[PDB]
Amino acid sequence: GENLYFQMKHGRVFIIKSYSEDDIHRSIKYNIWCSTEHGNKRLDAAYRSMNGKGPVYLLFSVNGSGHFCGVAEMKSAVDYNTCAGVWSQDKWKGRFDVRWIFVKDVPNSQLRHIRLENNENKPVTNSRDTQEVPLEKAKQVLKIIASYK
Ligand SMILES: O=c1cc(C2CC2)[nH]c(=O)[nH]1
Ligand SMILES: [Cl-]
What we know:
By secondary structure, the chain is of the alpha+beta class.
């Protein structure tokens, strides 16, 4: 048969890279995240220009792990003045709401043939934190993540 679900012109998709496995667990538990100052600025702009016309998806991967670990949607703008030190390292300023919609490990081998024309045609699996994913490649990534078993 066929699965044409992801094949939608409104939506923006970003890679999230975490050094910390603990912080992934905490994000899933409490449905919150924080990036760097410049990453927060990037995500906040995308969320606030989307005006709720479509989702901002976050594709999570722990640095060095060899796999993605799940997918969340942004659910709020960035609040830059929040309690410090709630994450494994005290390196972060602020907080935004997410909603994890998918938690499972997807090996990089399933995804490394998808390349990002906006990042020198490097594999999507070689991205840095808050690398944006072109929509047509994001649809391919989401289908692979959803279909993996
Ligand atoms: O390793 C990390 C850990 C976090 C915590 C959520 C703040 N954020 C990030 O971008 N990388
Ligand atoms: Cl695009």
